[PDB]
């Protein structure tokens, strides 16, 4: 390892590379990048004090850096990391604080930067060849999938909902799995999604007015602890039962791990595989 | 749907086919078959009163049939199923009781019957072509994977452990993921595995004596509720750290969903994909 210059989102950083002494704080994106690149960081984000089962693969050599939006500077300092992957979600004051603990790179949470985020981690870990192949395969699989989806499915109304604390949410067009569903696969975002500025509640009646052809439903028990029957109560509702998607057996619950971030390389790869299976002409 | 004759494990059954009026009780195998075949049964097994997140994809039209080994005959009777998929784990008295509720087929829990179990569900649902393709692809992918694993990896010591209630368990040679690891991929089962007659505790000291080249570790938070830090406490143990697999970064935690049964078609398909990635010569 020598100190190498890293360009990331038009900013220059200097980091000892390749390295495993990576502490991830705030950037759940980078944890999903670690998952895809088989990187085992020294520090990772805790979720209610735990490492989720979906992250145990890459936290096997990790200690917690704090909860997502509460960096534990003492914990980070103790690791003496070569690089801290923080997030653009952190205010400047917080990023400055983290930097007293080591070289800090704020990783973007914007889905359109998915390739740049994975390439950053690849450059830190000597895994450029692997990352470039994953990106190349995704582009190829996406083109192939789009060829295999007929014009009717392409023109259909698809929607991603997530159930959290028993409520139903939709997401902006470029956020969550919508950046794959609409931005990559080229399905048309409904007006409700175009109007959303962040995670947005919808009602069952609005869902019924939308009446999508396809509904991807994400439900994590970990995010519904107090409402564990929320999905089954929805599924029993006569208005849900009347939905075209329900009638046509076009509702896909947990097609991707329900804790998935949605807009990262790992999430996109998994969602593409799922959407391929559900939307392609063989069906 | 007409009544069709179904041959399953050298027994003849008569069932209205194709059907969606399938109630699954006891056979978690059949729920993983439903997952792989995209079958949405009318009745499915509850797990501590819930449908696990890994099964929400195929329980979207299901009501519970009871816990795995406590069939709820009232619930099953209410469904008026065309067929009940029960399990060979049930005593004859219990299978007779279930049969008062509908035509009952005891699905085998033995991993070597994985193809027969998936073909049974395929025959009930008109999905023979899909099931035959999945089996054909698995055979082909398995042959390909075996070609791609070099003789050194083939001769290496691999082990599957599962952590439950904070304890470490291994499994017989033909049980869990061992039927893929050893029986299909052709790696050699260690003596401890050959000696196991069922899920068997091992100690960290015995693991260290084994010193496998590769360790697959399965850990579900749902099965460790009272010991959530059991894996991290293991991973911090100096004796764990001294393991060759740990030193060589050859420990794979939750390579497959940790609630996976291990010996079913779905589990085998997922484990094969994982083992391919970890054991093939590119590494
Ligand atoms: Cl921890
Ligand atoms: Cl594809
Ligand atoms: Cl449910
Ligand atoms: Cl339920
Ligand atoms: Cl393969
Ligand atoms: Cl952990």
UniProtKB/Swiss-Prot annotation, chains A, B:
Looking up Pfam families in the UniProt record yields: Peripla_BP_2
The record's principal subcellular location, in a coarse class, is membrane
Q: What happens when the gene is disrupted?
A: Strains lacking this gene show a reduction in growth stimulation by the catecholate siderophores enterobactin and bacillibactin.
How does the entry describe its membrane topology? Lipid-anchor
A GO BP term, please? iron coordination entity transport
List the GO cellular component terms.
cytoplasm; membrane raft; outer membrane-bounded periplasmic space; plasma membrane
Ion transport as a keyword of this entry, yes or no, is yes
Q: Where does the UniProt annotation locate this protein?
A: Cell membrane; Cytoplasm; Membrane raft
- Signals that turn on the gene: Repressed by fur. Induced by Btr in iron-limited conditions.
Which InterPro entries has this protein been placed in?
A: ABC_transptr_periplasmic_BD, Bact_iron-sidero_bind
Assigned keywords, A-Z? Cell membrane, Cytoplasm, Ion transport, Iron, Iron transport, Lipoprotein, Membrane, Palmitate, Signal, Transport
Sorted alphabetically, which Gene3D superfamilies does this protein's record hold?
Answer: Nitrogenase molybdenum iron protein domain (3.40.50.1980)
Looking up SUPFAM superfamilies in the UniProt record yields:
Helical backbone' metal receptor (SSF53807)
Q: Any idea where the Fe/B12 periplasmic-binding domain is?
A: 22-282
Q: How does the record describe its quaternary structure? A: The complex is composed of one ATP-binding protein (YusV), two transmembrane proteins (FeuB and FeuC) and a solute-binding protein (FeuA).
Query: Could you tell me what this protein does?
Result: Involved in the uptake of iron.
- PANTHER family per UniProt: IRON III DICITRATE-BINDING PERIPLASMIC PROTEIN (PTHR30532), IRON-UPTAKE SYSTEM-BINDING PROTEIN (PTHR30532:SF10)
Q: Which family does it belong to?
A: Belongs to the bacterial solute-binding protein 8 family.
Kindly provide the name given to this protein in its UniProt entry.
Iron-uptake system-binding protein
Organism this protein belongs to: Bacillus subtilis (strain 168)
């Amino acid at each position: 390892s020598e100190k190498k210059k890293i360009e990331y989102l038009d900013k220059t950083y200097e980091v000892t590379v390749p390295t495993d002494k990576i502490a991830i704080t705030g950037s759940v994106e980078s944890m999903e990048d670690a998952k895809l690149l088989d990187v085992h960081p020294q520090g990772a984000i805790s979720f209610s004090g735990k490492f989720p089962d979906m992250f145990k693969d890459i936290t096997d050599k990790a200690e917690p850096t704090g909860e997502k939006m509460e960096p534990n500077i003492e914990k980070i300092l103790e690791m003496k990391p070569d690089v801290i992957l923080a997030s653009t979600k952190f205010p400047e004051k917080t990023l400055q604080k983290i930097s007293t603990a080591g070289t800090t790179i704020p990783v973007s949470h914007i889905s359109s930067n998915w390739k740049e985020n994975m390439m950053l981690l690849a450059q830190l870990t000597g895994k450029e060849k692997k990352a470039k192949k994953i990106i190349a395969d995704y582009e190829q699989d996406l083109k192939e999938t789009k060829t295999k989806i007929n014009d009717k499915a392409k023109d259909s109304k698809a929607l991603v909902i997530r159930i959290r604390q028993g409520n139903i949410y939709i997401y902006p067009e470029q956020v969550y799995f919508n950046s794959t569903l609409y931005g990559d696969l080229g399905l048309k975002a409904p007006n409700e999604v175009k109007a959303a500025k962040a995670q947005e509640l919808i009602s069952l009646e609005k869902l019924s007015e939308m009446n999508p052809d396809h509904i991807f439903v994400q439900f994590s028990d970990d995010e519904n602890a107090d409402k564990p029957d929320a999905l089954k109560d929805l599924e029993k509702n006569p208005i849900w039962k009347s939905l075209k998607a329900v009638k046509e057996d076009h509702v896909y619950v947990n097609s991707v791990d329900p804790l998935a971030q949605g807009g990262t390389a790992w999430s996109k790869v998994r969602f593409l595989k799922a959407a391929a299976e559900k939307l392609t002409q063989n069906k």
